[PDB]
Structure 1
């Protein structure tokens, strides 16, 4: 009965020649474990929303990906995290941007959705709201990793299978559940050497995250400014819904044509209401995985064959 999940962990240029297989396998194992968790939840009748929330939570926890633990550093050597989640069944959405004292932004985004009349909260206000609902306050030092610090130092001067450049790491999940509900979630640490207070596409409904039962669930990763300006995630939905494009056609138009034409780089993952799955990326590679409920998953980092 067509339940399916896809996940991503960022996009970038291929650096396989500098990697050992054992290094690559750490990424593959991470992606495999999370997608398999998602598939299991789906086959057991869990909701798309719960599935994308848990998958993004696990991706935040994984230090290899730019969200939560493993977040990139800002120019001030701090971390500012953003996340979004959307329920295609109700069209409700929750989002946080600019948070430093919450371990799992996607769970905070979810709290904004389910435990407030709002869609988006920012900064200390967002944190205070979450703390008032019992979410633990953490120090942002928990997110810090030497790989991302190395990259900050290289960035301000004049280690992974993919080179994200400064902006193209982020994480996300999309799912269609056994009830026909679509959901999407996205989380990020932003961009290496970011001007504090800058916001990219990840937490913005219709830019980095979108879900609607009648069309598509989408999560993006890439150079944020272009994905905002082109409403990348909603554009997929609109092309299909109004233009009558297939998911594949819509993905080609956005990722391979429109975004590049505006100078945007990255990719996205998408599931449509008929259970078609697509993981387009205009970069050389993208950390990714997907699988139908009850089938064996597929993972990838580099080019498709």
Structure 2
């Protein structure tokens, strides 16, 4: 029994993102193409303020995006703190397929994007500019991650050929310091895929996922025999432990992991209730709610 093809994505918008990914997966397409197409839908959406176009800018009014992609054979691509390109996941894929490198950041990422035909566009919408200038009044940095805030999209899929791939794209924490980079474009942090084991992607307070190399841990736990759900659970618990050891309050932190193994089994776990993920397989597309640590 292998549940494939199957795609999982973070948060409620992962439901329609999944529909796009399924257009590829249901036709026997590659997982890599499916996750790229899936997350691009959100990058393009001006109303999704935490991914691509319309994403809230850093505290200086700059919309800088981070994204990384990983296919079924350890090929990886990443862009971080890149401006003016609506689809960082696609530039990430170009970094992976067209360069000797796996990660480009800032001006260099943009210059590369432009050299690859991507079009420079203004990603700061009127709404984001308005909210930003308003936030500037008191400049109180307090990133909240909940059902209605900082919903980064991570997507992982197992295609008909039984290959895994994943993509993660975000606009990062709203009003972050200029140049701040989270977990989303870091392989092993926001995303990790090993075709002989499984894949996992993360969302939430990036700093904490970077700190625990979250997705690599989830996949390594699955490598050790943990079910996808259990692997995610333990990774969350590791963050809970570290948050405690660092003298911080868990209520201020939200992280969710979703995972998939080679047999198409899947799971998820998060720190705080309110996190859902969308799962689409041959049975249909559904919004599911994993367990949470903070009770």
Aligned pair partner of 1:251 in 232, 237, 240: 232
The gaps in structure 2 that reach 5 residues or longer are 244-252
Determine the structure 2 residue equivalent to 1:208: 190
Q: How far 1:302 sits from its partner (Å)?
A: 9.5
Matches within 5 A, 1:1-305: 2-9=4-11, 30-62=13-45, 63-87=47-71, 89-142=72-125, 145=128, 149=132, 152=135, 156-157=139-140, 162-164=147-149, 168-241=150-223, 243-255=224-236, 257-263=237-243, 264-292=253-281, 294-300=282-288
Q: How far 1:111 sits from its partner (Å)?
A: 0.7
Inter-CA distance 275–187: structure 2 relative to 1 (3 Å threshold): same
Q: Could you tell me the TM-score, scaled by structure 2's length?
A: 0.86
RMSD in angstroms over aligned alpha carbons? 2.6
Secondary structure of the structure 2 residue equivalent to 1:279: strand
Q: Is the 8 A contact 1:49 1:183 kept in 2?
A: yes
Inter-CA distance 136–43: structure 2 relative to 1 (3 Å threshold): same
Inter-CA distance 99–222: structure 2 relative to 1 (3 Å threshold): same
The gaps in structure 1 that reach 5 residues or longer are 10-27
Q: Write out per-residue CA displacement over residues 258-297 of structure 1, whole angstroms, 9 at most, x where no aligned residue.
A: 11222253102211111011132222222521111x3221
CA distance in 2, matches of 1:7, 1:112: 23
Q: Is the 8 A contact 1:91 1:211 kept in 2?
A: yes
Secondary structure of the structure 2 residue equivalent to 1:129: helix
Secondary structure of the structure 2 residue equivalent to 1:71: coil
Which of structures 1 and 2 has the larger relative contact order (alpha carbons within 8 angstroms, sep 6+)?
1
CA distance in 2, matches of 1:69, 1:262: 34
CA distance in 1, matches of 2:124, 2:4: 41
Inter-CA distance 104–300: structure 2 relative to 1 (3 Å threshold): same
Secondary structure of the structure 2 residue equivalent to 1:96: strand
Q: How far 1:246 sits from its partner (Å)?
A: 2.1
Secondary structure of the structure 2 residue equivalent to 1:269: strand
Q: Is the 8 A contact 1:201 1:208 kept in 2?
A: yes
Q: Write out per-residue CA displacement over residues 80-125 of structure 1, whole angstroms, 9 at most, x where no aligned residue.
A: 11000001x2201000001111111101111101111210001111
Q: Could you tell me the TM-score, scaled by structure 1's length?
A: 0.83
CA distance in 1, matches of 2:267, 2:136: 35
Q: Is the 8 A contact 1:31 1:288 kept in 2?
A: yes
Q: How far 1:202 sits from its partner (Å)?
A: 0.6
CA distance in 2, matches of 1:79, 1:226: 22
